[PDB]
Amino acid sequence: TRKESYAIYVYKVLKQVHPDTGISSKAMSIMNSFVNDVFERIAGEASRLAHYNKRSTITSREIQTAVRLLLPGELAKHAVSEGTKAVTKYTSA
Amino acid sequence: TRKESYAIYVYKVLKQVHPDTGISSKAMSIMNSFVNDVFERIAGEASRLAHYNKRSTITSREIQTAVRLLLPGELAKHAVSEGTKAVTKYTSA
Amino acid sequence: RYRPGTVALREIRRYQKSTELLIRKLPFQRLVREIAQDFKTDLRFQSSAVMALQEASEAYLVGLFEDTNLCAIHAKRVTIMPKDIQLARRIRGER
Amino acid sequence: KPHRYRPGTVALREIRRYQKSTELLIRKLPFQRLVREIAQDFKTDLRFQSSAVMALQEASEAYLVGLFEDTNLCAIHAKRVTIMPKDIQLARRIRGER
Amino acid sequence: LLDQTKDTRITHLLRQTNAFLDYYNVAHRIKEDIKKQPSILVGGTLKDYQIKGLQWMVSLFNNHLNGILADEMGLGKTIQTISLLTYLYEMKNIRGPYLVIVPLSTLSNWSSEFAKWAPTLRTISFKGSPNERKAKQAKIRAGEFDVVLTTFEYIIKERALLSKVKWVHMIIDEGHRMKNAQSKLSLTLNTHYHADYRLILTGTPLQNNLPELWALLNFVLPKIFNSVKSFDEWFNTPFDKIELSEEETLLVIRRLHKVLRPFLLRRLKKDVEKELPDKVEKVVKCKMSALQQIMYQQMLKYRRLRGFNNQIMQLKKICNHPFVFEEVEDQINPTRETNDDIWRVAGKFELLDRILPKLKATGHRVLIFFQMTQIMDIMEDFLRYINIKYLRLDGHTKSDERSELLRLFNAPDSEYLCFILSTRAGGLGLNLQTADTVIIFDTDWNPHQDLQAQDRAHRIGQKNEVRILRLITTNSVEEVILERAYKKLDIDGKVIQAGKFDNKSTSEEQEALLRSLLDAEEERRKKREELKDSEINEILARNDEEMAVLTRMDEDRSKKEEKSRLLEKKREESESAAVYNGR
Amino acid sequence: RHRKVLRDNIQGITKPAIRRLARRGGVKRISGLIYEETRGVLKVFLENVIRDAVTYTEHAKRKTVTAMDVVYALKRQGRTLYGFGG
Amino acid sequence: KVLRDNIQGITKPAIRRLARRGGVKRISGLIYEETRGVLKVFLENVIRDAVTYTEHAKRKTVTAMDVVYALKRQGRTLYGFG
Amino acid sequence: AKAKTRSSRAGLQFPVGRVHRLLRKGNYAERVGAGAPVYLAAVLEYLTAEILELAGNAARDNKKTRIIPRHLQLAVRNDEELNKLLGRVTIAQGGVLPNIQSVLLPK
Amino acid sequence: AKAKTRSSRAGLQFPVGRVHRLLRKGNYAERVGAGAPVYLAAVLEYLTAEILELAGNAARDNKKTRIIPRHLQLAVRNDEELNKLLGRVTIAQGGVLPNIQSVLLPK
DNA sequence: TCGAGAATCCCGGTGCCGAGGCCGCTCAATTGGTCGTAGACAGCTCTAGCACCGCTTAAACGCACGTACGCGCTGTCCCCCGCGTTTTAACCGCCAAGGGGATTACTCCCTAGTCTCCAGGCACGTGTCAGATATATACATCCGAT
DNA sequence: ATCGGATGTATATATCTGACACGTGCCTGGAGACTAGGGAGTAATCCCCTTGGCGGTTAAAACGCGGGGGACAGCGCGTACGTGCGTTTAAGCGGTGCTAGAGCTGTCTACGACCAATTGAGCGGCCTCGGCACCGGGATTCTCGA
């Protein structure tokens, strides 16, 4: 039985922002549970959107909207810019 | 395009409790939206239960539990008794 | 002339009775649209929607003034004050 | 004439002490005995992972704390510096916790 | 005395009237007397007193002043106002707008009267959703009219349109609706702007408290309501007594309407046709049933132990409402079934159990009246329990329902002997000439509703007597109200005297009526300060032959033993009666 | 196609009205300064809600804000409203 | 197993400490009961929901995940335990 | 081959069929047990019975034959456990419970 | 026939594959669009970048090389929009922001 | 106001254990293919929202007037904070022993998926009646004066 | 003190009108019926983790207490806020009229589901050295009587 987590991923990101900084185990468990949380929220919003408009399929456009609901203030603008760029490069390659 | 509702059902129940009482249209729209609400809650709980225990299938037993979470106080005991009786008679016939 | 403060205690017993909407339509609508312009422009509202915003609004401020009143009474004053409200919105965590 | 601080100063040292560190402020064994004692009512003969008990403690302390914050806001609003049962009761009333 | 003040008002009152353009001289200053009904009025001719009343109304606004007409029901008031109008259209060359107002049901009668008599004139009516009034309203806004006919309602609803337009003359009917200036209409008519001249009717002017003369009279001229408390002169004065309310009112009866002779008018049927054959005026006493005695006599403590005295506390006591709360009925029966002591508890029900059967043998069609609707319940259940053919009419009986109830009852062969009512509840206008027996119930605030109940029956065409038993129980609060409305009967009788010297504008008559009622007060005051089948058959006997069939009813019920009135022990019915009477 | 500029409509909420709301709440004696405080609070609240509603709308590519839009916005913010449909 | 008055285990020193962390300056002597009341209530709710989840899963043990789902249920989201 | 409705088989007033559809088409799980839609419809029936009962009573105590939102408001809020359940619900046209703090009263 | 990972194709640090699995196996809809798992992983990456950045800074300002929960607490709460977002979150071992009401101070 | 003493920080040393870096290595990634269908998109209709007018009219507002309350002070009283010494009860370390989970392979039947086949629920209708408002009759309350 | 005027209040009226109820017709979503199989259920074996018992160490809770600073209650005052009346204006409503845009429908078609094969990344074991706890010791500073 292998549990899963984002620990490795988080850690990579850390070494991208602060190459020198260790992250204690517990303080990883947080960031883990965090990411799972934000994921459950954003997904949940994608669902209860696609349900209303009677689409059957979560697409990007929903996820965009859902983000624009949950993330307050500037996290909206930045995050949206991020994802937009990401999918862009994705299709373009 | 035919919308649906519980209006007829609600109305029957009314005539079971108070044979004489009319129910104004708006005051029906409430009870409608209400029932849809409680439904979404109880279902939602059934889901996020069956997800944890790694069952793939909502069954009665879950719905029972979910009710025991949402309904406060005595509404628990009464409601549970209700459903129990209902399914009982159902299978037995 | 009545003892000041009595006419109020008639008003309360009046308004806590009935259900009617306490804000003039046209002003409130003009308000809502005015706010709406910022986010997107050239929008349509179903009348019933505007009705909704009003409903939630009044039904919010009301509870607000209830709780605020609890605070002012806690202060041994009978008169609510801006600092009272600010306390309320602080306790609930609305801002 | 032994030396003594102005009463109310030692506190203002304590606050600056505790708002610093993270440690858990309730003795384990008492708190555990409490939790189990409550648990008996609902079902009997239960097992707790230690980490779970740790959770209940975490949420508990992390709740009472916020409670005392807000309460303190009330007492200050009353031009008293001392929180009082009616203050808390006001708090739990405003939030709608009961 | 105040007569000279009245004279200074002879000058100045009519000064204000000059602004709005004895008293008798100066009130009649313009006399134009035409002794025939006009030309354009068609379909017959009015009676002497009728054309003289016409002529009278003419004389009113010849001098250009408003007024009132007190005439008794069924004396032709309708056709009178018709004639007055018509005369104003033709002989006065006025034409122009005329604002007439009625109660709804009567408006049919009115329309008919404009169909027969004056087809010459436009009569605008109103009814039937805003639709009909779109056409009709915009039709009037064009300036199209002769007569504009409507009810109380559409004065309020159309008050915009109607108020907005100029008018000539204003005809109110049933005018005692004006009784309280607080009534919406009374003030709306001032918000209504004005027709040039306003005019009123009544069956009966009303309570001796006399804001009524205030409300009406004041509403007759703005002068008058400016004069309200100069009425409070003799309205305070008239309202010892020989040297106070009599030696003064040996005139002041006059002197009030000796002033008001000219612009107020009246008549009586006994004066004009006097063809009313007869009817009898009787009362009875009854006993308070012991059950309705026990804790209910004590309801002074139940006043705190629950609603309100006069009705739910009081009138329940009076046999009127046995077990309306019904837990008393439960103390008798849960199943609400037929047995004794449920109906026996009341003088009404049991009493009828005694008296009615005799009538069932003598087949005299009975009338029954109430105020509180609900008595009619146990009344039915009682009648069915006796298996009696009866009819009731509630307040929920619709107009055409009413016509049916009438014609069925008024069918010549109708075998329903008793007919149930609640007086004011359905009273309106009605005619029952087929019923020979009237019986009255309970309090009936003010008599005038009782006079309604009576006018329902003895109206011309009723060829029997009319027996009347006002049903009262001994040692009962109903006696208080009864006597109260009885003193009302007195002083409003004095008011009738007002309508008398004022009625015929004669002298030996007016003094005959003076001495009349001033003697009546003496007699009545002097009188102020069991079932006995024989007695009952006596008060039921219009001949010794009724003493024959009624006493063969007493041959049987001689030998036969009649389910009596008193309910006498049942403890926990007492203590539990204290429970529910306290609950 | 009017040129649409709305300003100071927040004045449309009037001391009489706010006073009424206070009454319904059970307030006895207002303080004169509240009348601005309330306009502040209200304006905020509707900013949030109208925000979410508009967002739902644009997502559905509609030029209109239906009531259902609102009810979903309130439901989003944790204030559940009944009577307007769902 | 009979446990009684363990709620005394929460002690005036401790509650006093919590108060301090909150930023309370001067306590009133009566609070010490009030708090025990509040706390006892709160844990009643949470332990309730947790136990319910457990029995539903037919386990004799209450895992931490049970709790975290209970708190999440009551609208208090906890991190760090999974 | 004559069809009887499930809502009848359990003797319920709510359309057990319609429920069993909503569970599936709502993606609340992979598979829907058979007893569930029943057991749910029962609960709904019970609750709606509760509300409508109370609002009926209060409505009668206003001497009205026809239930209107105000009646629902008073029915809920006056009761406890419902208020516990609906606490964040807002009922349009709802009004407020009559309430005044004591100290506001004159003395 | 040489495989490249999607997380690379967009240049992301989060496992776009794993996301695209969780959406399906979580029953968040009937069907999962292709752009979605990407667009989501991007957002997560951004946020985690935010938190870890701030906690890194504060941790350095405590003269520590290794981030511990306290650092996360202070990073969140001190910032605004995060606090707005996490407001009901409780971080074990979190402690509290240093705070004292002014009037408590002696004068 | 300086002076003393307790509080607290700093630095340097010490000792440890977990953050983290690798190593196999199973399996969940990714490629690479069809295929059935969600949903895009013209494309059409009509409806519900916008604009504007003119109208009663019930509010909103401005205002002067007075007094109830917010408040600043004060002084009385006392209940809580700052520090003893006492007592214990948590803590930590240690152990054993066993239940309760977890895993594992096995059977089987409840749900999904289709396929017909109706009657239950929905949409439009034209009606009656419940609320609405004005009226009739008393008395009782209340309150803000006398 | 009365007491007057405005407010409820118990039964009853008269009507007005729009909104609810019963309905007739119609359509498709639900029921009946059958089949496949996979999720679910249940023995069976294993062992990791909870619980109990222990004997110590001491930090921390309990208890006492003198004293002091806060609570709290009084209160004189002056002033902003209730009330209300007279004047104004903008809301409410009914009307007209237009049309942007909601809402539905028929094809489409890209495209996501499914599957089989391929394969590398991501996760369990497994070390290690250094970041960090911790201690003691002087440096500083911060409170509290002058």
Side-chain angles (χ1 to χ4, degrees), chain E residues 198 229 410 488 517 583:
Chain E
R198 295 181 291 105
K229 291 182 298 298
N410 289 334
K488 301 172 185 174
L517 289 58
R583 300 293 185 270

Side-chain angles (χ1 to χ4, degrees), chain I residues 3-62 64-78:
Chain I
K4 185 189 292 180
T5 58
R6 275 177 287 183
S7 296
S8 61
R9 298 184 184 277
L12 297 180
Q13 298 302 319
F14 282 152
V16 179
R18 179 178 291 181
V19 168
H20 180 64
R21 177 172 63 87
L22 290 179
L23 294 179
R24 291 174 298 177
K25 294 183 184 300
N27 286 283
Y28 294 85
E30 181 179 1
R31 297 171 60 191
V32 175
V38 173
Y39 190 85
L40 176 62
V43 176
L44 294 179
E45 183 174 0
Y46 174 77
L47 294 178
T48 298
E50 297 305 319
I51 291 172
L52 294 180
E53 179 181 1
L54 297 175
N57 293 341
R60 185 185 66 197
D61 293 347
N62 283 283
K64 296 290 187 180
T65 58
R66 180 170 295 114
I67 283 176
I68 49 175
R70 175 67 177 170
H71 296 156
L72 291 174
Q73 184 74 60
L74 299 180
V76 174
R77 301 286 186 264
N78 283 334

Side-chain angles (χ1 to χ4, degrees), chain E residues 446-457:
Chain E
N446 303 342
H448 306 288
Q449 297 303 325
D450 300 344
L451 295 175
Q452 295 305 322
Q454 298 180 340
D455 292 345
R456 305 287 178 264

